[PDB]
Design a protein around this ligand. Structure first.
Ligand code: RET
Ligand code: D10
Ligand code: D10
Ligand code: D10
Ligand code: HEX
Ligand code: HEX
Ligand code: HEX
Ligand code: HEX
Ligand code: BR
Ligand code: BR
Ligand code: BR
Length: 265
């Protein structure tokens, strides 16, 4: 049960573009990691964990993107005018394993800026993480068959989509029922984060389906391109909005370092 990446030889332009996409993603996440670390001091204690979760996400994704880059250059060699598969192996499956950690972190930092606490926070986080883990795990099993069994990729993806929809319903319901509690005008900002999340996370099932409608070397490139757009949107851009909401609410709650931080800009 191979992946479609192992099926093709690659032109130098295709190979280097994919490598440059992954290495670019590493640099963006580690550059954002520094930003999230420095602005941590400008967030009130109640919200500071949300910015720390951005730091964990940046290193988690950055390590897996660097991992994918070197595996790409390990597994292929330029022979007779094209990059051909060598002794080693490349696989998008390590992305799925990493999602088991990064997705709960992304969801947790949203619940924190929604001002959920105590029993409701733990309760809502447990249902969301369980739904997300069911989405990822059924998706992982599905892509094992992206070459061998296209019908199984479809059926496991339908199961995965059911968890995805239920997960989004919980997220959206909590957002619209707790919007009134949010400070500094961030009741307007949080609805924008929900829509950004809808857009960015939907890119992943689209990349999952690439083997069904573009099973060639250019579809390998398009999938990595979609992953890159989705990774930056769902982690970096999303994290900046979460951090903005965290600081804005900190300032409205009387945190002086937050108020000063916004004043200078
Ligand atoms: C930073 C990485 C993120 C936010 C990854 C998100 C992943 C998903 C939303 C996964 C979606 C899937 C389905 C809805 C159906 C097909 C299989 C998956 C696992 C790709
Ligand atoms: C600003 C510190 C970010 C530097 C990123 C390092 C890129 C490593 C590419 C292998
Ligand atoms: C207030 C407790 C949060 C529960 C929201 C809905 C959970 C989904 C059960 C599937
Ligand atoms: C289709 C997944 C979208 C779920 C959003 C529902 C939010 C409305 C709650 C009032
Ligand atoms: C060996 C492929 C990577 C999957 C990790 C469980
Ligand atoms: C997998 C089909 C679910 C769609 C529900 C809106
Ligand atoms: C035009 C690109 C918008 C980026 C905002 C973060
Ligand atoms: C310096 C706080 C602003 C964060 C959002 C870009
Ligand atoms: Br506080
Ligand atoms: Br990730
Ligand atoms: Br409602």
């Amino acid at each position: 049960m191979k992946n479609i990446e192992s099926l093709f030889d690659y032109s130098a332009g295709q190979f280097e573009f994919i490598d440059h996409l992954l290495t670019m993603g590493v640099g963006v996440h580690f550059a954002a990691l520094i930003f999230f670390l420095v602005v941590s001091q400008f967030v009130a204690p109640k919200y500071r964990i949300a910015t720390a979760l951005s730091c964990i996400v940046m290193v988690s994704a950055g390590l897996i993107l660097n991992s994918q880059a070197v595996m790409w250059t390990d597994a292929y060699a330029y022979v007779d005018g094209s990059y051909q598969l060598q002794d080693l192996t490349f696989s998008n499956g390590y992305r799925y394993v990493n999602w088991m950690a990064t997705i709960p972190c992304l969801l947790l930092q949203l619940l924190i800026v929604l001002n959920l606490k105590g029993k409701e926070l733990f309760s809502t986080a447990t249902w969301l993480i369980l739904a997300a883990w069911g989405m990822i795990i059924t998706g992982y099993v599905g892509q094992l068959y992206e070459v061998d069994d296209i019908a199984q990729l479809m059926i496991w993806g339908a199961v995965s989509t059911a968890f995805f929809v239920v997960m989004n319903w919980i997220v959206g319901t909590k957002i619209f029922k707790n919007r009134a509690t949010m400070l500094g005008g961030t009741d307007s900002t949080i609805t924008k984060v929900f829509w950004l999340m809808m857009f960015a996370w939907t890119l992943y099932p689209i990349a999952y389906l690439v083997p069904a409608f573009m099973n060639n070397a250019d579809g390998v490139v398009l999938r990595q391109l979609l992953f890159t757009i989705a990774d930056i949107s769902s982690k970096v851009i999303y994290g900046l909005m979460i951090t903005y909401i965290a600081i804005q609410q900190s300032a409205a709650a009387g945190y002086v370092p937050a108020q000063q931080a916004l004043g200078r800009i």
